[PDB]
């Protein structure tokens, strides 16, 4: 009766994760509740032999030697920290021992070929990765960086995260790792311009990582960190002599960083196999502790250490001889293994079962450091794919920082003050044209107005009015119109200006031509020549516009920094109409019109002295065509040179139309209206 | 008694790496039998007890525990060939005060002495090649390098040590790159940043993929250099079995591997009295047919180190060692720290537990790796052996593709044609001056003032001259003679215009005052205010020469030189004010001359009015000078068009104002 069956244990009281500060009172209690019950093990008694591994495998090797080579034979081993658990689980197959880790999360321990006799109540760390990928997909992040300490737990967690992000279309664009000094990888992260960083390292290493982060200025509006939620709630305020940054300086470096953890405690008020709810368990464990749970390490993982003892006892119960066990016999080991494998029971941490992948807790908690205190921002279940968001995440500027400063394509527009001014000038120009037209057609033959050819001057003013009202299409940029309505503004430029120039220059070119060739007379030929000129011009323009329609085209410029804000670097791109082939059709058109203008100037100079009275004012017509010719021959190539500058081209076209259209109307009509009706 | 040592080696033949252990036993026995013949340890004798560790972390720890419990009082640990068990054993030495000395562990993680304070290593580690790479870079002036690291512990630690080795030197890291399974999702970034020297830290089977992707980006040839680790198996490139092998060999040809040197080439006598070549012959005739391991000399030197350390530790002096004596472990550690002697692998000396040894370089030729130099770490010297190292180019690959500044030149044929046209303008102006001066007595010329005409011909003659000073860029003019010529041209242009038009406005003043020597005084008074304006200009801002550089992007014609176009021009703090003042004064003079000319044309002077000519010339000048001012100041970033416009408008204006004044009189005289 009461034959003592001993178990070995390694509780880390310090180091990278001081889980033993609360996981030891968890088993010290669990051994009393399991020994007080008679239905569990009446013939045996579970006793504990424990040491302090301190997360250091060097101490764990010496203590495993002292455990495996002393007289009292141990039936099972219980390591904590991940490195100690890996060492023990890989060494134990030489002694035919079962290993049962209560606080090991390394995903590398899931394969049964390398650790064939290992079990754990702690869930695998691959549960953090679906939550991270969900938070990356929710906020549209596609490029993340990683920095982790080169421990197998973090390496395997990062490999699983890499596989998960590769599945979801996310890319890990930068990767850093360090053994004991993170200055170099943090400086490389700052040089490489990493925005969304994922840190996988212990708290004692996290303090140094973030001290170098503060000295490197790798925090603020542009960067966001994803840490692990297993740290103490004040790890950045703890005095540490190995790191320089003052706690008030370090509180700024850790700000707004997101952390994920697992619940590990059943929130339902149902009673477990031990006949106690989760709240009574927490209250009893807090009574067994020397200090508040907020300052005791490993308080979150104590239910796992509680359930590991019960799983061990329930597995030894179904196997009922245990004193004949020795490190040279594997039958008792196989029996206890097949009894542990098939274990399923309702413990304090929920439904305890030892599956192969190590995934039995579904809920993951997400929280954020807001003002020096953690706040829970939501939960996530990956087995059902449901995210319960609380909507309490605070960001600087009210939005999550986006990585990879993109390109914003903005258009350059015409300064609307100038366009409005020139439009007002053109409106006054067409009202002046209609006033002079009403004048010259009201006095059709009442007086000597008929001595000057009246219809030629009338339709000259008509062409002038069209060419002057053709400035509105030439000024309509993408600011007022949009793309769908745009291709008709291009033809409203071309037809109006071409027909206006043809009708307002051929009509006072044919008059000069007829003065020359009959005065150095016929009433209808003066209209036949201008009709032929305008018809042939319209033919030569329609062949171009129909054979090669004019369509929009964007010319893209080099990137510039619009740092009038703190936002994206834009690139400006101009939009304007062009043909599939350009500067050949427009060049030939300009050359032909320039030849007509030169011939007009020549004929107006050759006939400046004739004193005919069949035509009244050919000299003012000659001056008008000289001015029109000089303005158009100056401002035709200028708008071809300044095409990539919208305001200069528009001013040099619109003012070279406005001035010419004012000068021709004045020179023709104010002498006649002045001498006729003074 | 005997002084016992615990040797931990893979001895069995079931493991593939046991070929190392069975290779070094022929060597260690050569050291053991020697020590007992010369009797370095006089009262004691050394015995090394071997234990099989098949590199399983389970079997090796079992052997270590069984040697601790059932074995003699071991004073030291010796060996450890596989790093997985070697780190496990080395981290726990503090619990038994055992000092381990390895001869085949090369991972750099064992270099830090906060985690492994009792570990010693006779073979140069993986991160001991960085000081050699530094001296190789300083030998070829490669001051800018990129890196390609595989994200695992050993290679990331080598890279993190390299970052601290180059600190303080002039060498720069352009971009650090990392990968885990696909190596050339990162080689494209090394091609985009255009690094020419690449330091690689990756394993053997990743190197084939790295090189087969560097073949795609064409990151090979006469302008790229690879420096990867050389501890790879011989003929490692034949074992990769989708990528063609010929392209792999063409892409990898020329890489420089860096790895430790097995034996010393010096012929001086070692601590054992034999030279390295004699020891090599003794080793090659000691083992019959066992495969030769490259760690045999390091095991020989490790045994001699152990012997000398035990000698010094026993002369420093508790006689037994129950694994609890901390003082004896500390004495053995301090005696091991002071090891300094010449053995078959060079000078054995430790610096913080790590060996200071020689590192050789091997360049890849056709189908082999030949030795090209050696770096001695104790003397800190690099000796590249001659005639063996080569490059596919005539010179060693240079980093930092050259950038150079070149001026955006005003095309010489355009300047030539317009300078040949303006001299025709000047000779026709001089012919008109001859016409004016020969026929000065006829009434057709005496009706006009013949001196107010030879002032306007002077104005046009020197304003034609101003075209050249707009074309002098800097292809053939220096700093100061350009800076002063920039104001010589503005004096020339402004006084030419002011004389040329003030003279005809004075001629019109005279005819307007008569009809209702004094003509020169008012053009002198106009030049007075003009020179006052330009002296107030020069006293404030003398138009200092500036130069704008932009668009460092454009490619060359193909000689691989990034040409940076930049261009020089005259500016100041604010040219708008000065140009506006000058043009406003000149326009006021223009309008007040046209007014006075129109008053003369209102009354129809019979044969010398010429006010229609004043009107036409003033109109043409008023439009063309405004156009030339507004277009030259908006095409400043393309100077060829700027010059072709500012010269053409000057030609046109200064020819019209001459002809419309001079030709109507010559056409009626002849
Ligand atoms: C076109 C038109 C207005 C007929 C004209 C054109 C010229 C140019 C020499 C520039 C070709 C011209 C005149 C008139 C003058 O009668 C004057 F009035 F300008 F003197 C003159 O001889 O020059
Ligand atoms: C083992 O313990 C369970 C309660 O957990 C009990 O019901 C059972 O009776 C025990 N073993 C046997 C075979 O009685
Ligand atoms: C580290 O912090 C301490 C205390 O603020 C300061 O005295 C010291 O100068 C810092 N490090 C350096 C560069 O000395
Ligand atoms: C479990 O414990 C509670 C607490 O007193 C008790 O009321 C209940 O009867 C117990 N049930 C069993 C099955 O032990
Ligand atoms: C020890 O192991 C052997 C293996 O065959 C087994 O036959 C024997 O019953 C075992 N004895 C015990 C458990 O003491
Ligand atoms: C443990 O149970 C699982 C459940 O399917 C099974 O796959 C595995 O083979 C079992 N273990 C042994 C040793 O049979
Ligand atoms: C170590 O030696 C002392 C002195 O003889 C002895 O009392 C002790 O039992 C020994 N311990 C071990 C582990 O050998
Ligand atoms: C060896 O180490 C000691 C400290 O234990 C140190 O004082 C001494 O300078 C070192 N000598 C060397 C590195 O040769
Ligand atoms: C190489 O060594 C030879 C000695 O045989 C020497 O003459 C030659 O100058 C050396 N080459 C260089 C580049 O120093
Ligand atoms: N669940 C506790 C576990 C313990 C360990 O894996 O050593 C752990 C893992 C990772 C961190 Cl950062 C902190 C603690």
From Swiss-Prot, chain A:
- Attached carbohydrates are found at 244, 275, 317, 329, 341
Which tissues carry this protein? Highly expressed in brain. Weakly expressed in heart, small intestine and uterus. Isoform 1A: Mainly expressed in granular cell and molecular layer. Isoform 1B: Mainly expressed in Purkinje cells. Isoform 1E: Predominantly expressed in peripheral tissues as kidney, lung, trachea, colon, small intestine, stomach, bone marrow, thymus and mammary gland.
Task: Give each disulfide bond as a residue pair.
Answer: 55-81, 211-245
Name any GO cellular component annotation: mitochondrial membrane
Extracellular face of the membrane: 1-418, 480-494, 548-584, 642-649
| GO BP | adenylate cyclase-inhibiting G protein-coupled receptor signaling pathway; gamma-aminobutyric acid signaling pathway; negative regulation of cell population proliferation; negative regulation of dopamine secretion; negative regulation of epinephrine secretion; negative regulation of gamma-aminobutyric acid secretion; negative regulation of synaptic transmission; neuron-glial cell signaling
Q: Which residues bind 4-aminobutanoate?
A: 82, 105, 122, 202, 301
The subcellular location is:
Cell membrane; Postsynaptic cell membrane; Cell projection, Dendrite
Among its keywords, does the record have Secreted?
yes
**Which keywords accompany this UniProt record?**
Cell membrane, Cell projection, Coiled coil, Disease variant, Disulfide bond, G-protein coupled receptor, Glycoprotein, Intellectual disability, Membrane, Phosphoprotein, Postsynaptic cell membrane, Receptor, Repeat, Secreted, Signal, Sushi, Synapse, Transducer, Transmembrane, Transmembrane helix
Membrane topology label: Multi-pass membrane protein
Name the positions where phaclofen binds: 82, 105, 122, 301
Q: Which domain of life is it from?
A: Eukaryota
- Which sequence ranges are listed under topological domain Cytoplasmic? 440-458, 606-620
**Subunit note:** Heterodimer of GABBR1 and GABBR2. Homodimers may form, but are inactive. Isoform 1E (without C-terminal intracellular domain) is unable to dimerize via a coiled-coil interaction with GABBR2. Interacts (via C-terminus) with ATF4 (via leucine zipper domain). Interacts with JAKMIP1.
Q: What does this protein do?
A: Component of a heterodimeric G-protein coupled receptor for GABA, formed by GABBR1 and GABBR2. Within the heterodimeric GABA receptor, only GABBR1 seems to bind agonists, while GABBR2 mediates coupling to G proteins. Ligand binding causes a conformation change that triggers signaling via guanine nucleotide-binding proteins (G proteins) and modulates the activity of down-stream effectors, such as adenylate cyclase. Isoform 1E may regulate the formation of functional GABBR1/GABBR2 heterodimers by competing for GABBR2 binding. This could explain the observation that certain small molecule ligands exhibit differential affinity for central versus peripheral sites.
What is the protein's name according to its record?
Gamma-aminobutyric acid type B receptor subunit 1
What is the gene name?
Answer: GABBR1
Swiss-Prot record, chain B:
Q: Which family does it belong to?
A: Belongs to the G-protein coupled receptor 3 family. GABA-B receptor subfamily.
Q: Any idea what this protein is called?
A: Gamma-aminobutyric acid type B receptor subunit 2
Gene Ontology molecular function: any one: G protein-coupled GABA receptor activity
Tell me which parts of the chain lie in the Cytoplasmic compartment: 438-455, 598-613
Which residue spans traverse the membrane? 417-437, 456-476, 485-505, 520-540, 577-597, 614-634, 643-663
- Gene name for this UniProt entry: GABBR2
Disulfide bonds listed in the record: 55-82, 184-213, 212-243
- Provide this UniProt record's keywords sorted from A to Z: Cell membrane, Coiled coil, Disease variant, Disulfide bond, Epilepsy, G-protein coupled receptor, Glycoprotein, Intellectual disability, Membrane, Phosphoprotein, Postsynaptic cell membrane, Receptor, Signal, Synapse, Transducer, Transmembrane, Transmembrane helix
- Summarize the impact of residue 615 to W: In DEE59; uncertain significance
Subunit-structure text: Heterodimer of GABBR1 and GABBR2. Homodimers may form, but are inactive. Interacts (via C-terminus) with ATF4 (via leucine zipper domain).
Q: Name one GO cellular component term.
A: G protein-coupled GABA receptor complex
The root-end lineage is:
Eukaryota, Metazoa, Chordata, Craniata, Vertebrata
Per the entry's comment, what about the domains? Alpha-helical parts of the C-terminal intracellular region mediate heterodimeric interaction with GABBR1.
Q: Where would you find this protein in the cell?
A: Cell membrane; Postsynaptic cell membrane
Membrane side Extracellular: residue ranges: 1-416, 477-484, 541-576, 635-642
Which residues get glycosylated? 37, 322, 337, 386
Q: State what changing residue 627 to N does.
A: In DEE59; increased basal signaling activity and no stimulation by GABA agonist; when injected into Xenopus tadpoles, causes abnormal swimming patterns and increased frequencies of seizure-like behavior compared to wild-type-injected animals; no effect on cell surface expression
Linked pathology is: Neurodevelopmental disorder with poor language and loss of hand skills: An autosomal dominant disorder characterized by psychomotor developmental stagnation or regression. NDPLHS manifest in the first years of life as loss of purposeful hand movements, loss of language, and intellectual disability.
Q: How does it sit in the membrane?
A: Multi-pass membrane protein
The tissues where this chain's protein is expressed are given as:
Highly expressed in brain, especially in cerebral cortex, thalamus, hippocampus, frontal, occipital and temporal lobe, occipital pole and cerebellum, followed by corpus callosum, caudate nucleus, spinal cord, amygdala and medulla. Weakly expressed in heart, testis and skeletal muscle.
Role played: Component of a heterodimeric G-protein coupled receptor for GABA, formed by GABBR1 and GABBR2. Within the heterodimeric GABA receptor, only GABBR1 seems to bind agonists, while GABBR2 mediates coupling to G proteins. Ligand binding causes a conformation change that triggers signaling via guanine nucleotide-binding proteins (G proteins) and modulates the activity of down-stream effectors, such as adenylate cyclase.
């Amino acid at each position: 009766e009461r034959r003592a069956v001993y178990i070995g244990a390694l509780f880390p009281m310090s180091g990278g994760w001081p889980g033993g500060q609360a996981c030891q009172p968890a088993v010290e209690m669990a051994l009393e509740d399991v020994n007080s019950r008679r239905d569990i093990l009446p013939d045996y008694e579970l006793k504990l032999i424990h040491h302090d591994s301190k997360c250091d495998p060097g101490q764990a090797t010496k203590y495993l030697y002292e455990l495996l080579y002393n007289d009292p034979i141990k039936i099972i081993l219980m390591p904590g920290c991940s490195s100690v658990s890996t060492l023990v689980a890989e060494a134990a197959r030489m002694w035919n021992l079962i290993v049962l880790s209560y606080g090991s999360s390394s995903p590398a321990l899931s394969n049964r070929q390398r650790f064939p006799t290992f079990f754990r109540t702690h869930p695998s760390a691959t549960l953090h990765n679906p939550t991270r990928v969900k938070l990356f997909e929710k906020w549209g992040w596609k490029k993340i960086a990683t920095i982790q300490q080169t421990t197998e737990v973090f390496t395997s967690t990062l490999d699983d995260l890499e596989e998960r992000v590769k599945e979801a279309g996310i890319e890990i664009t930068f990767r850093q790792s360090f053994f004991s000094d993170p200055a170099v990888p943090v400086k490389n992260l700052k040089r490489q311009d990493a925005r969304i960083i994922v840190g996988l390292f212990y708290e004692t290493e996290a303090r140094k990582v973030f001290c170098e982060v503060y000295k490197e200025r790798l925090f603020g509006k542009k960067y966001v960190w994803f840490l692990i939620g297993w740290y103490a709630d004040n790890w950045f305020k703890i005095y540490d002599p190995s790191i320089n940054c003052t706690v008030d300086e370090m509180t700024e470096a850790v700000e707004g960083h997101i952390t994920t953890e697992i619940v590990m405690l059943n929130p339902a008020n149902t009673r477990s196999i031990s006949n106690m709810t989760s709240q009574e368990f927490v209250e009893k464990l807090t009574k067994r502790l020397k200090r508040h749970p907020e300052e005791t390490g490993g308080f979150q993982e104590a239910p796992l250490a509680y359930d590991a003892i019960w799983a061990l006892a329930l597995a030894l119960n179904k196997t009922s001889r245990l004193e004949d066990f020795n490190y040279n016999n594997q039958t008792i080991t196989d029996q206890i293994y097949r009894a542990m494998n098939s274990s399923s029971f309702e413990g304090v941490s929920g439904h305890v079962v030892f599956d192969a992948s190590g995934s039995r807790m579904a809920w993951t908690l997400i929280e954020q450091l807001q003002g020096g205190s953690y706040k829970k921002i939501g939960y996530y279940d990956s087995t059902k794919d449901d995210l319960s968001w609380s909507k309490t995440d605070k960001w600087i500027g009210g939005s999550p920082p986006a990585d990879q400063t993109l390109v914003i394509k903005t258009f350059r527009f015409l300064s609307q003050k100038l366009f409005i001014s020139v439009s007002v000038l053109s409106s006054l120009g067409i009202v002046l044209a209609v006033v002079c037209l009403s004048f010259n057609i009201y006095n059709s033959h009442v007086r000597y107005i008929q001595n000057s050819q009246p219809n030629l001057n009338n339709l000259t003013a008509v062409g002038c009015s069209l060419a002057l009202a053709a400035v509105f299409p030439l000024g309509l940029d993408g600011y007022h119109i949009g793309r769908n309505q745009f291709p008709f503004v291009c033809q409203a430029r071309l037809w109006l200006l071409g027909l206006g120039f043809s009708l307002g220059y051929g009509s006072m070119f044919t008059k000069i031509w007829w003065v020359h060739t009959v005065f150095t007379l016929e009433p209808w030929k003066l209209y036949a020549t201008v009709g032929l000129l305008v018809g042939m011009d319209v033919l030569t323009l329609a062949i171009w516009q129909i054979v090669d329609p004019l369509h929009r085209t964007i010319e893209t410029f080099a990137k510039e920094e619009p740092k009038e804000d703190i936002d994206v670097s834009i690139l400006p791109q101009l939009e304007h109409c062009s043909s599939r082939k350009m500067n050949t059709w427009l060049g030939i058109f300009y050359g032909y019109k320039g030849l007509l203008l030169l011939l007009g100037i020549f004929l107006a100079y050759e006939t400046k002295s004739v004193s005919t009275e069949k035509i009244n004012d050919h000299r003012a017509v000659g001056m008008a065509i000289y001015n029109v010719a000089v303005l158009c021959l100056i401002t035709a190539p200028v708008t071809m040179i300044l095409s990539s500058q919208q305001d200069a081209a528009f001013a040099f076209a619109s003012l070279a139309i406005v001035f010419s259209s004012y000068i021709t109307l004045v020179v023709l009509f104010v002498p006649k209206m002045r001498r006729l009706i003074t | 008694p005997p002084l016992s040592i615990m040797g931990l080696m893979p001895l069995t033949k079931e493991v593939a790496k046991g070929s190392i252990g069975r290779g070094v036993l022929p060597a260690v026995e050569l050291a053991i039998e020697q020590i007992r013949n010369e009797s370095l340890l006089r009262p004691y004798f050394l015995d090394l007890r071997l234990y099989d560790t098949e590199c399983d972390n389970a079997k090796g720890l079992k052997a270590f525990y069984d040697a601790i419990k059932y074995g003699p009082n071991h004073l030291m640990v010796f060996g450890g060939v596989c790093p997985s068990v070697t780190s496990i054993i080395a981290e726990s030495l503090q619990g038994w005060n055992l000092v381990q000395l390895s001869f085949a562990a090369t991972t750099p993680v064992l270099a830090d002495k906060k985690k492994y304070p009792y570990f010693f290593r006779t073979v140069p580690s993986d991160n001991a090649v960085n000081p050699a790479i530094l001296k190789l870079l300083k030998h070829y002036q490669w001051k800018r390098v990129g890196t390609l690291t595989q994200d695992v512990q050993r290679f990331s630690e080598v890279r993190n040590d390299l970052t601290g080795v180059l600190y303080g030197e002039d060498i720069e890291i352009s971009d650090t790159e990392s990968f885990s399974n696909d190596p050339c999702t990162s080689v494209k970034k090394l091609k985009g940043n255009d690094v020419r020297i690449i330091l690689g830290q990756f394993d053997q089977n990743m190197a084939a993929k790295v090189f087969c992707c560097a073949y795609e980006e064409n990151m090979y040839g006469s302008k790229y250099q690879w420096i990867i680790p050389g501890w790879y198996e011989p003929s490692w490139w034949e074992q990769v079995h989708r990528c063609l092998r010929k392209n792999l060999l063409a892409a990898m040809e020329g890489y420089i591997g860096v790895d430790f040197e097995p034996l010393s080439s010096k012929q001086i006598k070692t601590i054992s009295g034999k030279t390295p070549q004699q020891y090599e012959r003794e080793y090659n005739n000691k083992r019959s047919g066992v495969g030769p391991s490259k760690f045999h000399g390091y095991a020989y030197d490790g045994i001699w180190v152990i012997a000398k350390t035990l000698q010094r530790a026993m002369e420093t002096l508790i006689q037994d060692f129950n694994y609890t004596d901390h003082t004896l472990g500390r004495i053995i550690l301090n005696a091991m720290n002071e090891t300094n002697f010449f053995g078959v692998t060079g000078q054995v000396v430790f610096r913080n537990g790590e060996r200071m040894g020689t590192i050789k370089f091997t360049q890849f030729q056709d189908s082999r790796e030949v030795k090209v130099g050696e770096y001695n770490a104790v003397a800190d010297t690099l000796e590249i052996i001659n005639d063996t190292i080569r490059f596919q180019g005539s010179e060693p690959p240079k980093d930092k593709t050259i950038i150079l500044e070149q001026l955006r030149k005003i095309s010489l044929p355009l300047y030539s044609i317009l300078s040949a046209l303006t001299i025709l303008g000047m000779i026709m102006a001089s012919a008109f001056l001859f016409f004016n001066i020969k026929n000065r007595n006829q009434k057709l010329i005496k009706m006009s003032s013949p001196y107010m005409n030879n002032l306007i011909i002077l104005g046009g003659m020197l304003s034609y001259a101003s075209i050249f000073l707009f074309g002098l860029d800097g292809s053939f003019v220096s700093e100061k003679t350009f800076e002063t010529l920039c104001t010589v041209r503005t004096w020339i242009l402004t006084v030419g215009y002011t004389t040329a038009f003030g003279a005809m406005f004075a001629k019109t003043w005279r005819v307007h005052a008569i009809f209702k020597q004094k003509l020169l005084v008012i053009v002198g008074g106009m030049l007075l205010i003009d020179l006052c304006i330009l002296i107030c200009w020069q006293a404030v801002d003398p138009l200092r020469r500036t130069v704008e550089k932009y668009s460092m992007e454009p490619d060359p014609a193909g000689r691989d030189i990034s040409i940076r176009p930049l261009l020089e021009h005259c500016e100041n703090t604010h040219m708008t004010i000065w140009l506006g003042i000058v043009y406003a004064y000149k326009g006021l003079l223009m309008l007040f001359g046209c007014f006075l000319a129109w008053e003369t044309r209102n009354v129809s002077i019979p044969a010398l009015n010429d006010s229609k000519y004043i009107g036409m010339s003033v109109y043409n000048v008023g439009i063309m000078c405004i156009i030339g001012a507004a277009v030259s100041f908006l095409t400043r970033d393309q100077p060829n068009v700027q010059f072709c416009i500012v010269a053409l408008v000057i030609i046109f204006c200064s020819t019209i104002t001459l002809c419309l004044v001079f030709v109507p009189k010559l056409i009626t005289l002849r």
